[PDB]
Structure 1
């Protein structure tokens, strides 16, 4: 749109996510730090009246952040909550960890985990403007090396593209995820086993998650936003998966 278009904000069924209805519908989330876009996406401003306040809403880009592709795809219950805590994996920049911070509010915090120091410097710079973000530059494959910094997160979200996605998620969820906590994993079929096709990869990785006592609840292909992808949302049972 432009600088004169007006929209009506209607709350989405998932809490903390809002819908901007205009001539075209947009997916929007309320911002922590107003006035600056974390990656150049557009932003909506409302005014609410006591002297008035000007709270700013920020659009969620679907084609760059894979969580926003799954929301407009439609999920049963994405376990990332307005109050709970979320353990990101693979947040290089704030491509999606800004919006995940935006949907958990000031009451909950978000633990961004990444390896390389080149986007970790950006992750440092954003996390001191949104106070609910704390970054982990420590290696995501070994949860022992950063076990000081995270205590009993409620959700784990995977975006790392290493082929041992099942091992790196189980080793995080066995030590930091609560019981009955949500497991979201963005399965990329090219990054896991490129010799075999997409649905074989999806059947293999959801079976490895079942072996590590992570019950799957739903999967979504998120096809029109990204080719050859899926997100698997499920609950960490850990006591009688059957």
Structure 2
């Protein structure tokens, strides 16, 4: 065997080095004994490190591909926008174990799967809603430190901006995974991302990180921006 090293990176996220030259990361499970999506687990005593698969989570893909700005901390309040069976939300909940994760889902069937997958992760607050209409859940969602968005729609940038106006603290962060083809099927991906970046900046964000998440996702880029208001 080779030496093994698990060290904390960012805050409450862990780099896993099995000595085989492959990059791996994990989160500390807040629900021991449960596998959310058949992820591999490294159990040390009572602590369980859930291997965070970049092939199944765009956030893990961004970290594996070089993300340097990771605003989600242990006491962070996060607004999660986007269809999910529970994969990324489960890991985000592990990270923000002293915080809250508001998960917005429109389809009851999607929420059904999310509730089953993230069962017992009590810091996740499910909210049936439409991200394009944040005013509807504004009496539920308190001001957040981070908005994480994974919505493959042409108006995804506009959605992040409106939700930021309603819920993001000044100085807070917006993380958005953008699928180029969900915006335009003709333009070159390079140009699409340039235009989307401009839209986010015009909306009030100062872009501080940008990660191409290939080969885990084709023509998808994770943008991270600090919210400065208007």
List alignment gaps of at least 5 residues for structure 1.
48-53
1:58 to 2:54 alignment: no
Secondary structure of 1:96's partner? helix
Q: Report the equivalent of 2:214.
A: 223
Contact 2:24 2:64 in 1 (8 A): no
How far the C-alpha of 1:5 sits from its partner, in A, is 10
Q: Report the equivalent of 1:135.
A: 126
Deviations 1:99-133 (A, max 9, x none): 0111111x101111111111211222344410110
Pick closer, same or farther for the CA change 1:160–1:97 going to 2, 3 Å.
same
- Superposition CA RMSD, Å: 1.7
Query: Residues 21-36 of structure 1 correspond to what in structure 2 (within 5 A)?
Result: 21-24=17-20, 25-36=23-34
Deviations 1:195-214 (A, max 9, x none): 11101110111111111111
How far the C-alpha of 1:92 sits from its partner, in A, is 2.1
Partner Cα distance (2:17, 2:220) in 1: 28
Q: Report the equivalent of 1:42.
A: 40
1:112 to 2:103 alignment: yes
1:98 to 2:73 alignment: no
TM-score computed with the length of structure 2 as normaliser: 0.93
Q: Report the equivalent of 1:9.
A: 6
How far the C-alpha of 1:55 sits from its partner, in A, is 1.7
How far the C-alpha of 1:147 sits from its partner, in A, is 1.4
How far the C-alpha of 1:26 sits from its partner, in A, is 2.0
Secondary structure of 2:85's partner? coil
Deviations 1:135-171 (A, max 9, x none): 1111111001111210101100110111101211111
Contact 2:36 2:118 in 1 (8 A): no
- Aligned pairs, number: 228
Contact 2:135 2:166 in 1 (8 A): no
Partner Cα distance (2:60, 2:190) in 1: 22
1:213 to 2:211 alignment: no
List alignment gaps of at least 5 residues for structure 2.
none
Equivalent residue for 1:84, pick from 55, 76, 85 = 76
Partner Cα distance (1:68, 1:227) in 2: 15
Contact 2:86 2:118 in 1 (8 A): no
How far the C-alpha of 1:83 sits from its partner, in A, is 1.8
TM-score computed with the length of structure 1 as normaliser: 0.89
Q: Report the equivalent of 1:50.
A: none
Higher relative strand content: 2
Pick closer, same or farther for the CA change 1:61–1:20 going to 2, 3 Å.
same
Contact 1:127 1:134 in 2 (8 A): no
